[PDB]
Design a protein around this nucleic acid. Sequence first.
RNA 1: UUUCUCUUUUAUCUU
Lengths: 20, 21, 19, 321, 311, 309
Amino acid sequence: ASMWERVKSIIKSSLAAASN
Amino acid sequence: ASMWERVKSIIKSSLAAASNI
Amino acid sequence: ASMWERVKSIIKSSLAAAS
Amino acid sequence: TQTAPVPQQNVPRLTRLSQPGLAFLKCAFAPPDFNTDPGKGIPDRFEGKVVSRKDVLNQSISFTAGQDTFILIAPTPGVAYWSASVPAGTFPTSATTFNPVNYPGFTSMFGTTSTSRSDQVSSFRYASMNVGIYPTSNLMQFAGSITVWKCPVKLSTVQFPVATDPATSSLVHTLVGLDGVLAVGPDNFSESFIKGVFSQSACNEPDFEFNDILEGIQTLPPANVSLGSTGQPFTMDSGAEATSGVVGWGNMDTIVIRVSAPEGAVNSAILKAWSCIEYRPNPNAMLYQFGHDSPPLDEVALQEYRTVARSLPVAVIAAQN
Amino acid sequence: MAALTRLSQPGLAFLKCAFAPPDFNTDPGKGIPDRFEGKVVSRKDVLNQSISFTAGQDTFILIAPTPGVAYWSASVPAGTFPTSATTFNPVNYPGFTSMFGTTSTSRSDQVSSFRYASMNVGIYPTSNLMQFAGSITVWKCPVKLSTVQFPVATDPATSSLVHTLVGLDGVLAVGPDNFSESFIKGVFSQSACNEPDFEFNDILEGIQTLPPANVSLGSTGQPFTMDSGAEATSGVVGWGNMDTIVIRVSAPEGAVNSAILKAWSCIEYRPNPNAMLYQFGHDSPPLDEVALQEYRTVARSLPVAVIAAQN
Amino acid sequence: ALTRLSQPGLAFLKCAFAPPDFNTDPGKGIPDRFEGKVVSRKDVLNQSISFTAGQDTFILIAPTPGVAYWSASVPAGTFPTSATTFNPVNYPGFTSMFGTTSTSRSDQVSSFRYASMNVGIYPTSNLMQFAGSITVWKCPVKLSTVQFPVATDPATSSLVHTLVGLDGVLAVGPDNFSESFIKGVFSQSACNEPDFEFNDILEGIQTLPPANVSLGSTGQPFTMDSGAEATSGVVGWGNMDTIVIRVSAPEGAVNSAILKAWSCIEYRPNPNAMLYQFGHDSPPLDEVALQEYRTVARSLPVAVIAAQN
RNA sequence: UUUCUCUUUUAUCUU
Ligand SMILES: [Ca+2]
Ligand SMILES: [Ca+2]
Ligand SMILES: [Ca+2]
Ligand SMILES: [Ca+2]
Ligand SMILES: [Cl-]
């Protein structure tokens, strides 16, 4: 997991867990 | 809490005067 | 044109891409 | 009419509070009301490493009769308040000097040298600053009043020349806004001493920016500087570097309390001072293992804070703390 | 429309004092609609000055975020810019002394800190079509008040630290972003907050000149000097977070360039409880997201300056 | 999902946390309320570096404009002492931006704000000769002041710059990354304030403590010496925590690497500087990007091995 | 501040 990949997932994971 | 209740009062008083969209 | 009008335009032009 | 225009280029074309947010509002406005410090940090954008210290002071004190005692709850980390008394009916003069009363553990946080202040923590920011006065005098022995008002005291600087050889220019710390202590502010609480008092300060900035720890300050005016040079109305002397000092100046208005004991009055009371502070711990400090991250932004809390602060009275009697 | 109705009243007024002050019967200004709601005193400073420009010389005017002072000026030889030999003298708004006292150490007596909301300037030519000549050029500089550290061989040897104006060098060249037009067309320009938010700045005590007394221009890095003169009449009581408006009025030999100069400053001060000024205070207006956003947008969308016929 | 971010908001996040993963143009500015004219300086360093055996080399990635990092080596197993002096390694073009004398630092630009600060160490030694470790932690170092009296005639009071929090470098922080040297490392710092405030360019700073000031009267545990004013200097201190890296090479170890440093900085250009030609408005507020910035920063590890940059 | 098409021409985001 390149840094950017690790970051994108954190974002998507964050933006998603915040759509609840 | 005559001070925490004073704060809770202000919070609901403004959280209500601003919840009537 | 006026200065307040030039500004009132920039406000309504950008607040046009907001809704 | 026949003059061509000059070419112009480059022209422009139902939410509720979080736990930490709720706790933040409690440490901020009503600390005596809770079994424990509800505080957890500042629910603003910042989420870096911090250590939340909840400073509390219990001081049994007696007010000299015929004197007007002035207490200053200032944003000075580690120091609960600054005191000085002047003859009844008067205010601090150039002849006055305020002395600090430390919060418990001052040395454990800021060392014993005026240059050891930033050994444990490098910077800080106040989340709350409260004060309370609970009269212990019997009904027939007391007499007098308690008056409270708040001052926008900031730590600025002064620039003046010094005739050394070669000629030199000096720049030193200087407290601006102290002149506000020389009169009772129009926005104030005033009541019988026996009724006690409880009051709180609040961030005097649009947001909670971090302020740095300051090294070397033991007095203001500093050593070798005349009060005349600074423009300050009086002096702040923290004393022995091994017991106290001025480690920083937070962004909170300073609370000014004036207890007036007329002649023959026995005015005794307990003074409490609260202080919720978020510090930036040094990795080497032993203080660090207690740290956590500042809580996440909580818009509701940040707005309620401002609304509540503005809606509360300057202060209230001790019965309603 | 449905754009000027989402704004709180103070928010709307904020945008007005900020961008178009001449257009009103009264200043709408009432404070900055941001998170801060503490006690303040709003002062709208206005300077009106009939001025005549020296023919054969380029006059430089600086609208700086120095509380109480409308502007700083100095005139140099035609076609040149300020040099190390140059010194700027401040022109005060009415009542400087009633605000900041008469000695360099009584500046924080009435107020302790401040923050600018707006800072505008306008030049209205009054010359007839048979006498005017020259140009008006405007550009803005990000001048900040920093400090310089240098050693001094005193006994014992010591290290000095003093105030320095950083970015003053921007005044020595007309940047690619500018307004430049015939004198007769006059000009109107504004400045805006050069920070992401409106934080308070402390009142500075004891500053009469920069470089300060006993400090050589050379050791400060400044390209020229700022001299407020008699402590009893003026001084630098602080440096706000607004960019500085630079104006170059160039008059040829034999030209009669007369005009009226106006300057506005909407400032929010933290009043001292003892000050007589305090009884006029109120709370800074509450946060208005819309206004804070329009401010930013409008600000960067407006041209450096515009001719006088449109202010 | 990544479409809720503005173009700049996204670019901003990339310069911030993964500048090495992109070929070019990592960011266009900070998507905060500020939209005034700025110049986005993309500072990148490529320094080959050999660590002397028996020494524990300390590298500090500080928010000092134009200077990539500062370092000093100390005996194995020890930390910097009052006897230590850190020396800087500049980013290409230092003088092209801050001049050649300690009082010409504000000639080109007047102020600044850091957007990102990243560092990576890529081992270049073979697998049979290296030894040792790379340890990383972050310190809340700020540039404050110290007040003390001097017995001159007349007697006077001095006020000088002093770095507070350097003491954090004297011990391995509890929150840290530590692993075999051969695995290298990548780490980044973040804004240590609730927002991106501008700081002013500082004139005349060549050393801390200053010339004529004794360490100890400052409180600093060691010295920062930028050297010749004509080649380097301390032009400012940004609001970013300092990244401390300790590469400890045992006796006999042959540890070498390539160090890379990245810094996105928004500078307020002066009209008289040529640098101004490349100015532009800072990007508009992007509430989502600003919130994700905080989340991502808090969520990432202190550092990661080189292979995961 | 004004209206679209067209190719642009970069630049991301997605398979
Ligand atoms: Ca701030
Ligand atoms: Ca004074
Ligand atoms: Ca210079
Ligand atoms: Ca120390
Ligand atoms: Cl007049």
